[PDB]
Write a protein that binds this ligand. Structure first.
Ligand code: ADP
Ligand code: MG
Lengths: 41, 578, 470, 317, 193, 159, 193
């Protein structure tokens, strides 16, 4: 029982890690979308 | 004050230009209808207003005026028998105006400006008032509402209006530096109300039920947490510990939940009975009400409104029980707030500051001496309910880190018809070691020892529960069957309690001590009867156990006429045996 | 109509419009191409520089030279009336049955004003659906929202259409309540295919259950913003009927998963950062917005009951769509893949199903005095019959006790006479008749959770005499 | 000296506000931010440039504006005024006294970041401080001049072990070469985010048996802002390094909950727009925990020690 | 354009026993076969191209191997179409946008097949459309939306992907054409997760 | 590497069991290597000179300390020579493409320098197209005597 | 530079029993020691620094604690290498960059260490370089990469991390120098996942 619980908790933590990386990349690309207008000026 | 115009409308985010000089996190009215929104992100000449309602219909060029003051609460008389919502808009007068719906832009005031109160001052012109000093009384519901000077105002008083029938807008005293003082004041709901000294928990919040003050106390000025699963008897437990409480002001905070799960609060709660006068309980209760389809910012600010109202009532010198139901609902409202602000999330989806906001909620709750010079408390029994039913979300972990007691309701016991459904194997309370001298004085000098003895018996029954589950109670040895039967009589008499009964609804410390000593004396005298060699069968069928059974269905007028006779019967029926 | 030529930036679905300050936020526009084709769009992000317009359809013939936008209906409304009880509409509200358009009695905004929690009653009386394992073991009450947690291959459209053509309030079970309350069904099908659209129009024109029902059907090749607007149209017709004409309205929302996918793709099209597992951060409020438009109201006689249906994406209750739906609604009824493959209709196992608001809407004066105790006894008896069925694989039939074989035969008879209903229509009396015929298999005294008066009245009945399920 | 108040804020978003033409501020300087009412906040200068410098505000930015807000400059390096009469008093998370007594008349103002010790000047920890706990005496052994954490849980008593080995731990020179008058002992105790229940518990345990006459307390409630929880171990270790390397004490430092320090660091670290590490905790958290763990140890030539006990609860075990 | 869309009541006989007995496909129905690499997608779809009772077969290689289009070019003229006597290659159209061909043409490759199948539907035939690797069309849309510097949905795909998939799979389904006679397109799509 | 060198030293077609007569045409070898360290390179060149194959092989070597962007051009110019030798001089080229994971991390580097949206685990969205344009340049053509057979080697990271 | 890299054919005698019998590294070899905390990983590195057959030892420690540095500085001049006699410290060049010391300098610490090991390799010796917590060097590269506004890949580390790490481990080898004489440098890298 705790072996399967440890595997489940490990997989859930690394999936949350990948999701947090994706929402970092989306914020970076939204800043880079916004920079086009400030360079358009 | 400072009036700009809209230049951009994206979702609930209105970028309004013109407002140079506006303050941050400051309420403002956006649009020609008037839409309440808070100002974030000042940038140059503009200001980004997060609007509470839907913006569908707003054009560009409409005025945005500024309030000047943050999200505040209007503290004063006229709040008891009151059903507010998350930003303190009285729902009954909205029902009186706009029918069964809440149209956007209903402007109603938090207090009744038309109700005439009966002023009676306790100052005189020439007195020197500093903050917190009580300067008059108003009778509200058989409840002497003591009007305070707002806690950052001082000066020399004059022009005290005489004892008459006034209204809440009229100023009652005037300082010698301008500065009139009305019957109310606006306080920001996020800064804590100032006091002079937090005391320490050494006085118990007497709940009313004889498990949550004997086995798991909470120590007035303290902090508890209860989980709510379905079918546990949650609402009857909250209503019983708000009906039979030690406190004398109750503040209930339903912080955004199902419509049908609190429209049976709003119809079952104003028909309860205050069991000290005879009238209803709503005469000393303020009730903040949010369903799950209200705006997100009200549904996030409701607990801060609840704590600020409860601190206003502790500043008068009272005992307030704040029960903030479903803090997990609040936490995902805060998660939705942080999702529109473009923040990097934390452990599940939560903000990085979830536990800082939870600490700011729970740690504003303690036994205190106020600025006037008298004690008061904001004991919080706020609940929690994770969606999975497991206790390893970030919300429940942060709550268990920052509370002082935890009372695990389990739905299995209410399925087994054990009311209240407090699991004792998973509950805990840290206020036991600190509430020691109050027990030693006001109950008995040996009270923690037999409290630990009953906890020892309930430990050992569940310790040897596996042999009973594998075999059955009739093949345990002798003393182990005595252990399971005395644990059974602890469960079926002491811990279990009927909240709908006449006199079993309340159980004080003396009555709990009486039943406590009665059960423990029967145990450690029947143990000696087994040490004689008496068989187990004659111990169980025995007529004195009916007295321990109806030990709890006895009025406390007549418990010092019952306890002595039952304790004599136990010694008699265990010296009569062989 | 003061059309705005002179635009820039058509890209994806979006197009920017210069010099558009009179377009209100949330307004609707007509976009006329140079050929003469008129599209529809919705204004987002209005500003002094430019206003963004999200186009409903594709952007194929559009160009920067010959294109004009014109304002239509500056907030999204529908024209609502009583003469739309036999009609089909498509997401926005255009009739697709070929019949003439309705004459609108009112012109209501489609987004919801929230009910005032002062002014809601406690939902206390019941509604039958004809399905026995919904009516008896976990009752739907008038004023309740509860979803069907369907699966991937499971038949949810069939149970949707069956509850639609089979639901009926029975005021005979009170102390002669009058039939001056009428009943009506609003049916919002979103994300559906051509095949199941033909199935619903066949199923509603076949039995004649179209005269008390109004349908809002949109396909999958319709624009996704129409899938956003479809439950708004359904719930505002529901609130109009039930709070202006005192109807008892049942709102069946098919495939709430498709609504959530439409919401995610429109959020990512409007360029905002998602929250948890890719679904948007405002999903709880935007989903309680259309779940919390159901319930009784004090002083009104009408009511809005609501059945959302949603498929779990890989049959787990930790996905955000069923997690937040079960975190808003009142229980669930859950289709099992196991009973469907075994071959049983409707495939509802009652062990993970729950009606949180059941116990209010049953009892004396509501159905019958034994309804809750029959439900509890059937739940316990089936719940300990299933594990005995699982146990007999490794012990053997003869090596059990008497009561264990009695529970095993109870489970075997239960899941092919009580759950396996077919399309027979059962009232609450035939359903409780079959329930007592099933409880008659177990001996007296093992029926612990029933009072002795009801056992003395109803124990003892053959299954091969009642012919409710022969 | 002379006061130089910058006006002209251009952008205030979260904890961040952009002061323009503030070229004369250094990186990492400490500023106070006067509101348009009179309520001064604090902040630290990050990201200095030629067109704006980014003040990170310590407390919440509620009430600020762009017309009346001033940014002054207060003590470019974050110093602390330390004297030797601190032994037997209680302090804030910052260092302000909270016991009803007048403040510390300072003998020396030394910074709270603390310079790294030189590995040729450090020596080996080679002696024995005795706690009362039999396991930590006999099987494990707290050597005088090291750091060792107490890994605990949720329902595990760790505050009681803290308050126990804070009051019954001593160094015993009579088993060594004596000099028993020569070496005194002291305790610095920094609590980072505690319930008022835990506050009164530590104050009763330190005033119950006369244990406070040796110790200095840097208690921090959870009502307090998060920057006090960040600054608490650095204040405690500044006082520890002063008392150990200026007067030859044998300071025992107890950092009773580092998990709240790490959560405060994760909260204030989601304002620099930097990608987090494992589960939201920042990528620099090894360096930030190391800059307050490595400050223990013994230095050759001297005779003083700094011995750290970080107590920390595993969030799941 | 079309006159009416019938409801389907006649199976698409694959020939494989499990896919026709336990999990059947009507003649105006869509079907989807996902699986990992090495599981049996392309061999199954060439089996459907080789043995089914479609009057014409449109095989859309959308971003897959060239050897498994060379197989279909070489060993189909050696076979015999059922329901007639002519060879099997005489009833199939073969759109082949392989993996090393340019990536922007895969959207065009997945639409050319469905409009050729609609054209043979409008003549009274019963067309099968075996389109493999719609996920490669999704990946091609992702690669071109990277050049558009847009903001994506989950996994990187542009947010109009399921609108494209709905508009693709909705173009099937047993119709009565503008000429009065009836026909069908049935779309079997391989997905490569 | 030992399995690839064993295949490279003992792969022979069987002409007698096939029924195309007999000639025993041996294999030309094109060996592309991207980040071989020194030990793998020493093993491969000692194996080739021990079996006598460096007179039939052409090697495009890229050591571990060489710059990590020319790994993008290494397999393409190996397979250019392979397509040339097979389809314009009718050889039977066997192409050993060592350690494609280094090629994929090189293109991850150059695709994360350009801020491009990735596929899964940071690798860019066009890695399928790059690996396709490398791999699919092999096989046999019609009416011509040549062939390009490919054995790549992959180091699966967490196997 | 070198003249020619040879093949390693003589073991690096670590003096242990599990790291020379069962799993040996040769003289021009490269080895890596993972492991969580409290699992040795410091006493094994110091045992490699004490009891080896190497002529000189470059002990570069980046990002780890300073008590180990002062332990090596205290207890080496009392010991004796079992090759030439005399003190053990007369063959160790130790480079310390403690974790409280600056974080952009532990990138340079590794290159300084391997250049010093290559300098003693170019004279005819057999250098052993113990590179301690190269994961802290990866964290330093993560720090400057996030300060430089670069795209991460797999938990914040820059995409060129494997290239930098390969260019560090590639310098170890058994060569003949430009002076004619042969030399070698081996690398034992402690990694802390
Ligand atoms: N239905 C089948 N019958 C016989 N062999 C099969 C079958 N499916 C797969 N195979 C074997 O496995 C291989 C699978 O290839 P394929 O299905 O094209 O992989 P993928 O579906 O991943 O592209 C085939 O070349 C064949 O050798
Ligand atoms: Mg394939």
């Amino acid at each position: 029982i705790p072996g399967i619980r440890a595997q489940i908790r490990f997989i859930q933590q690394v999936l949350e890690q990948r999701e947090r990386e994706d929402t970092f990349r989306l914020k970076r690309i939204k800043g880079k979308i916004e920079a086009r207008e400030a360079e358009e000026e | 004050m400072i009036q700009g115009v809209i230049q951009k409308i994206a979702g609930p985010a209105v970028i309004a230009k013109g407002m140079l000089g506006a303050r941050m996190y400051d309420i403002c009215k956006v649009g020609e209808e008037g839409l309440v929104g808070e100002i974030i992100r000042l940038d140059g000449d503009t200001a980004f207003v997060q609007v509470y309602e839907d913006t569908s219909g707003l054009k560009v060029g409409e005025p945005v005026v500024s309030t000047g003051l943050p999200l505040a609460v209007e503290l004063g008389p006229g709040m008891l028998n009151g059903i507010y919502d998350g930003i303190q808009r009285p729902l009954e007068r909205i029902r009186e105006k706009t029918g069964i719906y809440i149209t956007r832009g209903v402007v109603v005031h938090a207090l009744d400006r038309e109700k005439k109160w009966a002023w009676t001052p306790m100052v005189k012109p020439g007195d020197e008032v500093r903050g917190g000093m009580v300067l008059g009384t108003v009778p509200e519901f058989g409840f002497t509402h003591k009007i305070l000077v707002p806690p950052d105002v001082r000066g020399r008083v004059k022009e005290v209006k005489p004892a008459g029938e006034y209204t809440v807008e009229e100023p009652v005293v005037v300082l010698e530096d301008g500065t009139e003082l009305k019957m109310y004041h606006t306080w920001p709901v996020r800064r804590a109300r100032p006091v002079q000294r937090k005391l320490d928990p050494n006085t118990p919040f007497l709940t009313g039920m004889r498990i949550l003050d004997v086995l798991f106390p909470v120590a007035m000025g303290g902090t508890a947490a209860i989980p709510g699963p379905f079918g546990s008897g949650k609402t009857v437990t909250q209503q019983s510990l708000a009906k039979w409480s030690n406190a004398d002001v109750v503040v209930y905070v339903g912080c955004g939940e199902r419509g049908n799960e609190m429209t049976d609060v709003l119809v079952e709660f104003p028909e309860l009975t205050d069991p000290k006068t005879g009238g209803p309980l709503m005469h000393r209760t303020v009730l903040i009400a949010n369903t799950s389809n209200m705006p997100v910012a009200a549904r996030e600010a409701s607990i801060y409104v609840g704590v600020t109202i409860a601190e206003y009532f502790r500043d008068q010198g009272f005992s307030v029980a704040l029960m903030a139901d479903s803090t997990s609902r609040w936490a995902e409202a805060l998660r939705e707030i942080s999702s529109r602000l473009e923040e990097m999330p934390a452990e599940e989806g939560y903000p990085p500051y979830l536990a800082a906001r939870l600490a700011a909620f729970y740690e504003r709750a303690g036994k205190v001496i106020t600025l006037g010079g008298e004690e008061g408390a904001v004991t919080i029994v706020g609940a929690v309910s994770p969606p999975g039913g497991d206790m390893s979300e970030p919300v429940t972990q942060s709550t268990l880190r920052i509370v002082g007691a935890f009372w695990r309701l389990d739905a299995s016991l209410a399925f087994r018809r054990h009311f209240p459904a407090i699991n004792w194997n998973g509950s805990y309370s840290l206020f036991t070691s600190a509430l020691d001298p109050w027990y030693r004085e006001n109950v008995a000098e040996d009270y923690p020892e037999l409290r630990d003895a009953i906890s020892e018996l309930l430990q050992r029954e569940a310790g040897l529960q596996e042999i009973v589950q594998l075999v059955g109670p009739d093949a345990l040895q002798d003393a182990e069957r005595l252990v399971i039967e005395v644990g059974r009589i602890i469960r079926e008499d002491f811990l279990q309690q009927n909240a709908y009964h006449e006199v079993d609804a309340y159980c004080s410390m003396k009555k709990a001590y009486g039943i406590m000593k009665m059960i423990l004396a029967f145990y450690k005298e029947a143990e000696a009867a087994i040490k004689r060699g008496v068989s187990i069968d004659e111990i169980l069928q025995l007529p004195v156990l009916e007295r321990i059974g109806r030990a709890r269905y006895v009025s406390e007028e007549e418990f010092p006429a019952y306890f002595e006779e039952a304790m004599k019967e136990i010694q008699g029926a265990f010296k009569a045996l062989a | 109509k003061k059309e705005y030529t002179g635009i820039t930036y058509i890209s994806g679905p979006l197009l920017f419009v210069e010099n558009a300050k009179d377009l209100a936020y949330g307004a609707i526009v007509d976009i006329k191409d140079g050929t003469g084709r008129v599209r529809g769009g919705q204004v987002i992000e209005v500003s002094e520089e430019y206003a963004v317009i999200q186009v409903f359809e594709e952007t194929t013939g559009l160009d920067l030279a010959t294109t004009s936008v014109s304002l239509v209906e500056d907030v999204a409304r529908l024209g609502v009336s009583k003469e739309m009880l036999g009609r089909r509409f498509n997401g926005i509200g255009k009739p697709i049955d070929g019949l003439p358009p309705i004459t609108p009695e009112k012109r209501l905004p489609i987004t919801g004003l929230p009910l005032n929690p002062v002014a809601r009653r406690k939902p206390e009386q019941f509604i039958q659906t004809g399905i026995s394992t919904i009516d008896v073991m976990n009752t739907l009450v008038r004023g309740q929202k509860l979803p069907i947690f369907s699966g991937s291959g499971l038949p949810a459209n069939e149970i949707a259409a069956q509850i639609a053509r089979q639901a009926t309030v029975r005021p005979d079970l009170s102390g002669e309540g009058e039939k001056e309350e009428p009943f009506a069904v609003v049916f919002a099908a979103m994300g559906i295919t051509q095949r199941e659209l033909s199935y619903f129009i066949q199923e509603f024109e076949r039995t004649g259950a179209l005269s008390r029902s109004v349908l809002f059907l949109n396909k999958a090749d319709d624009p996704t913003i129409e899938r956003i607007l479809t439950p708004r149209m359904a719930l505002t017709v529901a609130e109009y009927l039930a709070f202006e004409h005192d109807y008892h309205v049942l709102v069946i929302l098919t495939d709430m998963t498709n609504y959530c996918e439409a919401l995610r793709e429109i959020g990512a099209a409007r360029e905002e950062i998602p929250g948890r597992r890719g679904y948007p951060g405002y999903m709880y409020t935007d989903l309680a917005t259309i779940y919390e438009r159901a319930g009784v109201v004090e002083g009104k006689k009408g009511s809005v009951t609501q059945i959302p249906i949603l498929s779990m994406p890989d049959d787990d209750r930790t996905h955000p769509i069923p997690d937040l739906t079960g975190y808003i609604t009142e229980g669930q009824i859950q289709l099992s893949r196991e009973l469907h493959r075994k071959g049983i209709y409707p495939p509802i196992d009652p062990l993970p199903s729950l009606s949180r608001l059941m116990n209010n809407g049953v009892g004396k004066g509501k159905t019958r005095e034994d309804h809750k105790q029959v439900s509890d006894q059937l739940y316990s008896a089936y719940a300990n019959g299933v594990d005995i069925r699982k146990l007999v694989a490794i012990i053997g039939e003869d090596a059990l006790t008497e009561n264990d074989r009695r529970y095993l035969q109870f489970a075997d008879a239960f899941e092919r006479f009580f759950i396996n209903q077919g399309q027979q229509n059962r009232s609450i009396e035939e359903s409780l008749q079959i329930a007592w015929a099933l409880l008659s298999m177990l001996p007296q005294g093992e029926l612990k959770r029933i009072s002795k008066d009801h056992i003395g009245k109803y124990y003892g009945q053959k299954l091969e005499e009642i012919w409710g399920a022969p | 000296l002379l006061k130089k108040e910058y006006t002209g804020i251009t952008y205030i978003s979260g904890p961040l506000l952009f002061v323009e033409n503030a070229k004369d501020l250094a990186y990492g300087a400490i500023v106070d931010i006067k509101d348009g009412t009179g309520r001064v906040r604090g902040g630290q200068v990050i990201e200095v440039s030629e067109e704006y410098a980014v003040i990170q505000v310590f407390e919440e930015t509620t009430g600020l504006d762009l017309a009346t807000t001033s940014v002054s400059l207060v003590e470019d390096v974050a110093r602390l005024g330390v004297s030797k009469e601190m032994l037997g008093r209680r302090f804030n998370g910052i260092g302000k006294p909270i016991d009803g007594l007048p403040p510390i008349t300072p003998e020396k103002r030394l910074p709270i970041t603390g310079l790294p010790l030189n590995p040729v000047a450090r020596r080996k920890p080679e002696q024995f401080i005795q706690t009362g706990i039999s396991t930590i005496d006999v099987m494990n052994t707290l050597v005088r001049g090291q750091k060792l954490p107490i890994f605990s849980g949720s329902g595990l008593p760790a505050n009681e072990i803290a308050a126990q080995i804070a009051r019954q731990a001593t160094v015993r020179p009579d088993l060594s070469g004596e000099g028993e008058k020569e070496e005194p002992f002291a305790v610095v105790f920094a609590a980072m985010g505690i319930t008022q229940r835990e506050l009164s518990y530590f104050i009763q345990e330190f005033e119950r048996t006369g244990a406070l006459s040796r110790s200095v307390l840097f208690l921090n409630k959870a009502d307090d802002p998060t920057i006090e929880r960040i600054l608490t171990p650095r204040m405690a270790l500044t006082v520890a390094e002063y008392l150990a390397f200026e007067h030859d004490y044998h300071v025992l430092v107890i950092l009773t909950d580092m998990t709240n320090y790490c959560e405060a660091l994760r909260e204030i670290g989601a304002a620099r727009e930097e990608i987090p590490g494992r589960r939201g905790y920042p990528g620099y958290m090894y360096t930030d925990l190391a800059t307050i763990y490595e400050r223990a140890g013994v230095v050759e030539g001297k005779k003083g020690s700094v011995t750290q006990i970080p107590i920390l609860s595993m969030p799941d075990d």
